[PDB]
Amino acid sequence: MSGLRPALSTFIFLLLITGGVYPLLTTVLGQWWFPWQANGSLIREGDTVRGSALIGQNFTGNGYFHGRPSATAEMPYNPQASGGSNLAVSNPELDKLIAARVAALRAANPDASASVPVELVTASASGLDNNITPQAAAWQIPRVAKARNLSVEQLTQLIAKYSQQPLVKYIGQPVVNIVELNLALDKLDE
Amino acid sequence: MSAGVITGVLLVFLLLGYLVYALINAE
Amino acid sequence: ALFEPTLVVQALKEAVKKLNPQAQWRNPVMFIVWIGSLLTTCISIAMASGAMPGNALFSAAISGWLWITVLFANFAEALAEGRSKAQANSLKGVKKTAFARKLREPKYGAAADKVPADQLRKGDIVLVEAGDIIPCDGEVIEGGASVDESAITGEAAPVIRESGGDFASVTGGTRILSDWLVIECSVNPGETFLDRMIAMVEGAQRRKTPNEIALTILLIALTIVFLLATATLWPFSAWGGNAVSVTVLVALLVCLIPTTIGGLLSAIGVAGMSRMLGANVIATSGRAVEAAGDVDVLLLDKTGTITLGNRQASEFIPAQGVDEKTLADAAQLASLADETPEGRSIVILAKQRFNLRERDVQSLHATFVPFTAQSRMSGINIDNRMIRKGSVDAIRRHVEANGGHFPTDVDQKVDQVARQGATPLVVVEGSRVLGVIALKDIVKGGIKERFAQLRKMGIKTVMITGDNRLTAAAIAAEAGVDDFLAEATPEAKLALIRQYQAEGRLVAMTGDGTNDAPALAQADVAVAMNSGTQAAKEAGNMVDLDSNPTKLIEVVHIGKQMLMTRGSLTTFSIANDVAKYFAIIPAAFAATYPQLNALNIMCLHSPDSAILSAVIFNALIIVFLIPLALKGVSYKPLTASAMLRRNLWIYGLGGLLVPFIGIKVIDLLLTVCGLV
Amino acid sequence: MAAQGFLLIATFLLVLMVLARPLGSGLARLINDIPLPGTTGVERVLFRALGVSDREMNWKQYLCAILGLNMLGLAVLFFMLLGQHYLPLNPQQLPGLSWDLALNTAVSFVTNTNWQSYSGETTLSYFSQMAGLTVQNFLSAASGIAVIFALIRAFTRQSMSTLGNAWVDLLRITLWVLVPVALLIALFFIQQGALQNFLPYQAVNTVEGAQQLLPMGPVASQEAIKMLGTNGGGFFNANSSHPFENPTALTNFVQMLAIFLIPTALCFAFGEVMGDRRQGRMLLWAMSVIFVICVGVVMWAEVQGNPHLLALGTDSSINMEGKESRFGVLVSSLFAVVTTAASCGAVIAMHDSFTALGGMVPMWLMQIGEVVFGGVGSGLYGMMLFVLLAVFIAGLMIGRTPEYLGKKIDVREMKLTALAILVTPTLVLMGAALAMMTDAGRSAMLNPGPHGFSEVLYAVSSAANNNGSAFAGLSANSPFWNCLLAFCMFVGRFGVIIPVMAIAGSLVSKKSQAASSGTLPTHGPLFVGLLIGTVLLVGALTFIPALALGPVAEYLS
Ligand SMILES: Nc1ncnc2c1ncn2[C@@H]1O[C@H](COP(=O)(O)OP(=O)(O)O)[C@@H](O)[C@H]1O
Ligand SMILES: [K+]
Ligand SMILES: [K+]
Ligand SMILES: [K+]
Ligand SMILES: [K+]
Ligand SMILES: [K+]
Ligand SMILES: [Mg+2]
User: Which of B1, B5, B23 sits opposite D415 (nearest CB)?
Assistant: First the structure.
């Protein structure tokens, strides 16, 4: 047998379906049901968008709640080139980066424990991370409490209110959405 | 990259070809 | 057989190095180690010559230990071949004296003349008297005497080989005791089974069993794996720093590849053939022997195979309407001219009971109807009206052709005779029947215990008999077999072998008759009886010599021991390689990778001592597993899963822990001797 | 922590078997040429339109059909990716690819490996990542399922020298197993916060005021088949670490379930097709024991972590470098072992910032041949090759003829099984040797020391074993690296495919034998341990040197 026609017909049909029905049906269903989630979970304040609720941003200033460091290309937290540090545990470059990050965090937070959390000094896998543990958030309370004149208890209730916990205690980790927390903190304080 | 290296690579390829030929024609 | 005579070992030690110069083309696993040995020797010579600086004594010792590893593998192969050659020399025989008497008339017509036996063609009759060795295979057509099969079989026992019936075969090389015999040249000399088995082992025509080709493919694949790992190990260390030398890579490759099974596989095959022949059963091809391990049914003949043959009558029985002299006169001439054992038995018993001196062979002539195994009929007709004899079914269907009504009291009598355990024989008075002749058969001893052992092993023994239904039950009750196939035409076994073959099962059987020859030729594992025709001898792929109907248990012992030993050595050679890694990999990278010394779980002295100890163990495990390959590993009749578990526990974790202790002992011995 | 990890393994395996039990009967129905409970004439009118019938063709035509479909797909991918800017739906106006990058990505998406040498959001357009990526993910998954379906049909069919029809197999698999389950998975991803749109890159001003460009596009439709068919390669560079790809732990758990759904369902389909489910559960035990051992070892290694962090003023010694924060270290370890064992290129962590032993174990699972819940059919026929080796060795040990499921294993089966075993490690070792002998190969290095050779060996192993997950520190965008990897992936997958089809065609010519007394039971703990030991020793005696020069050297340093 030769059979060039059924091979081509099968390929054209299974390209047409999986490239013009299933992605189109998925897009139509997503935009018709869950548009805010499907469009990027953007926080829209006015004519401009402050950011997405998942991708995270960079907070250099001491007033805001700092997140995990990013190893993206050019500026940190750049979504045009995602990825991690790709540095092994036996890398002196990673050693200097870790030491510099610990020194910077200890200089920024004098009224805290010297045992810096691992998340605030280690780069994330994607480089676009919007989550830290509430233990690290409790460690980062005093810098914000010194920068802006609010209560430690008030910050604790705000962070617990903005703490997305997983459905099961151990399927993931308890985390806080950093960008939304900072935006809501700014909106509530001013 | 050198004469000894290419000689060793050639000898390894000869042994690999002989072993593949023996696997095909173990008879 | 003697495992290692010093004379034959030092005789074959030259043949060990005769197979060294490029005769290992057909062995790829050891051609790899021979190429590595030559490469290490050449680099050691060039290394001591001034170029490629380093410690040339270590490379020279490595080259020498690979060379004597090759020598040990060739020693295993040559020792197996020498054992087979010694067995062939023991089974040469006495027949070199070609003093044969050329006979002209096909009877006892004198004609005693000394002629060479090299011109003996098919169709030439030879007659020799007692006390002289018979030249070739003999199918006696008339006569019968006592022979001595010691030099051919292995034991001396008075056996009587008559003519006419199934037990009319004598093999050349057997002395004669009492009376002259008649030798019929059915096969040309040099083409008999004895010449075939003594000539195949001389030449190197070793047609490998398909299991052996498959395992050779697997071992070649393992060699490819280890060759690629060794070859690609060089650029990794070259990038990491100072590259490893060629000789350490060759030593690691040799310690890695399956040298043990790859050098002992041919020794396993040849020694298994030698042990096969050592059980007085001969196999012309191992392809059937390797498949003989996977058998489940055994088909056995009764008349002449399980029983001793020579059915002798015990007592006549009369009927309601017949006298005894009327039995005797028909019985003495029913098979008077036949050379059948039952015919001679009824003649001698009739003459002992009545002494009726009737016509000696015939009045003037007769019909002389032969006995066919399919119709079971014989008769002589000169003065009466078509009087005959035969089995129960044949006599009944002749009654339906002649008399119609059959005596039910005689049917009850043959039923009670069958329950007693005598093979029935009914003759014809011409229109009606007179009764049965009871033939009290005698059976060979030990078959009950051997069939119990076969049932323990799991081979379903089936009786094949065409005598009577109740006789099969009576012979099965005292022998211990499974369900039989009684009252069967000899074509039923020909249908049944193909029936069991078409079901996916592998069928095996035994036989001696000429009618059984298609079944011997078509069966998978078909041993040939020693007291059997040359047609059955050439049809069966194997031949027995002990005249035992249940040598198949020894056949499957040899086949299963072959497969067990070969697979066990394979798994041992697989399990050696993790200890080979733990000996060489920490040793191979010392200056370039100083942090790899933490993997010395054996705590060896120096890296060179570790590599040398690994190569010494690679040679020593082969030379220590030569006796295991010669003997064959231990086999017991058990569950297949339990046997797999036992083989795993012996040649798995056990064959993993042996190289650790061996390498540690060799390294300690090297340290205390102070060489390295 | 150890109890939490053990609970994670237990609940993941439990819900995996729960979701794989109904799929096993359906896949068995697909193997046995039995139509679905639906299919009310739609299959007949579709096959009449497409010009295919309910034929029955042999192994040569089946293999030719699969190879021709894959080659036509590869050519279409290469031309589409070369001429990317001509095709519409390119809001970023990204230009056409290089010839080497286009060839590498085309071979990458047709040969189920899915190695990504680029960054997706600044490399490929929306229509490119739709048509040249998701379609070929579907087709490669369907090709793997069709090949393993033909192998199971060969094992279950007696004296029938034909092996079904590849066209009807591909059609039924693609449009009844892959598409609707991917639709449900993508809708769940959209519910949990994935991305599916076609808007241009939304400019975002941050809270502080810095510029930020958020990429968009159909991410969830890619992710669904990307996890269902074990076809790696994400919409973005951070493969399944981007929050636009993995928003929540529920999404990550569903991704794990989608990865392990099809190999477990294929084992269950083997058990249902072959009558007794003991032969389908022996394989699952053989996968599960090695999987649990590797997951526990990697979790222990990652929990012990890096002592340098605790020495440098950090409370936690757990190595969370290059890891997500919404995803725990135990979850990252489990997902890493899952993707490195099941030929999925998803990377929850960058796999390079792991500990040396915790990168040694998943790369060893890569190098053993991708059998432990491996690939999409590609792991199950490799496991079948290992089962043929195991039954040959077991028949040698018991003295019986080597047989499996009533089929006597012959010299042709041993030849082709040995060739299929040898295709992957010869390519891994030769590619690693060729990469480490060239300055172009070694100039993609990032981490100095033996971890760099670990990166190169992981790259070549993930290539030739068709996995696609990377340490990502290797700068594999060079033309030499792209051509070498593309060659390794292509000849590896198709030179394992061809002898597997040849074994299937050698087994259709034979006939099954009824199991009797004294045969070898091909189940139970003894045979499970024998098969696991065979797989472990074949994967170890090949690669203990390379592992000892790489991650073991780094760990002992
Ligand atoms: N010489 C003979 N003449 C007549 N009938 C015979 C003779 N030999 C055997 N029979 C009958 O034929 C049957 C032999 O069957 P079977 O065992 O198949 O052949 P064999 O004894 O030659 O092996 C016996 O039952 C016997 O009654
Ligand atoms: K192998
Ligand atoms: K594979
Ligand atoms: K594969
Ligand atoms: K990837
Ligand atoms: K392997
Ligand atoms: Mg007979």
Answer: B23
Whether C173 and C133 have beta carbons less than 8 Å apart is answered as: yes
- Asked if the C-beta of B24 comes within 8 angstroms of chain D's C-beta atoms, the answer is yes
The CATH superfamily assigned to C313-440 is: Calcium-transporting ATPase, cytoplasmic domain N (3.40.1110.10)
**CA gap A172, D181 in Å, rounded:** 24
Question: Contact at 8 Å (CB) between C162 and C225?
Answer: no
Question: Which residues face A51 on adjacent strands?
Answer: A43
Nearest to C76, CA basis, from C15, C150, C122: C15
In contact, C552 and C247? CB cutoff 8 Å: no
Topology classification of domain C90-201: 2.70.150
Q: Concatenated DSSP letters for C410-475?
A: HHHHHHHHHHHTEE--EEE-SSSEEEEEEEE--B-TTHHHHHHHHHHHT-EEEEB--S-HHHHHHH
- Cβ neighbours for C293, distance < 8 A, ≥ 6 positions apart: C556, C559, C560, C562, C563, D399, D400, D401
- Distance from C-alpha of C402 to C-alpha of C544, rounded to nearest angstrom: 45
Six-digit token string for D396: 């040698």
Task: Specify the pairing of strand A48-52 against strand A42-45.
Answer: antiparallel
* Experiment type: cryo-EM
The ranges assigned to domains in chain A are: 1-39, 53-189
- The CA distance from A175 to the nearest CA of chain D, in Å, is 6
The CA-atom distances, in angstroms, between A20 and each of C661, D126, D143, D184 are 67, 13, 20, 17
User: For residue C416, what are the contacts with CB-CB under 8 A and spacing of at least 6?
Assistant: none
Check A77 against D212: CB less than 8 A apart. Answer: yes
One-letter identity of residue D335:
F
Burial class (CB in 10 A: 0-12, 13-18, 19+), A151: exposed
**Cα(D388)–Cα(D426) distance, rounded to whole angstroms?**
20
List phi, psi (to 5°) of C511: 180, 170
Q: Regarding beta strands C525-528 and C507-511, do their DSSP bridges make them parallel or antiparallel, or are they unpaired?
A: parallel
Half-sphere exposure for A66 (CA within 13 Å, toward CB): 27
Per-position DSSP letters for C114-128, written without gaps between them = EE-GGG--TT-EEEE
Interhelix angle for D219-228 vs D135-156, to 10°? 20
Residue to substitute from C641, C647, C649, C653, interface D, most D β-carbons within 10 A: C641
Return the partners of chain D (3 or more C-beta pairs < 8 Å): A, B, C
Strands C507-511 and C297-300: parallel
Q: D216 with D222: CB under 8 angstroms?
A: no
Residue C305 Cα to ligand 7 midpoint, Å, equals: 9
Ligand nearest to the CA of D464: 4
Tokens of C603: 């705590």
Q: Which residues contact A11 (CB under 8 A, 6 or more apart)?
A: D69, D72, D73, D76, D139
Q: Which residues' Cβ are closer than 6 Å to ligand 1?
A: C 303-304, 335, 338, 340, 342-343, 371, 373, 376, 378, 389-391, 423-425, 465-467
- Neighbors of chain B with 3 or more C-beta pairs under 8 Å: C, D
- Look up residue D350 and give its two tokens: 């960058």
Q: For residue D332, give Cα distances in angstroms to A86, D154, D319, D371, D474.
A: 15, 39, 11, 21, 21
In this structure, which ligand is nearest to the CA of C389? 1
Give catalytic residue positions of C.
301
> How many Å apart are CA C275 and CA C560, to the nearest integer?
12
Q: How far is B24 from chain D (nearest CA, A)?
A: 7
Q: In terms of Cα–Cα distance, which of A82, A180, A68 is closest to D193?
A: A180
Closest-CA residue of chain D to B20:
D419
B4 touches chain D (CB under 8 A): no
Residue C394's φ and ψ, nearest 5 degrees, are: -65, -40
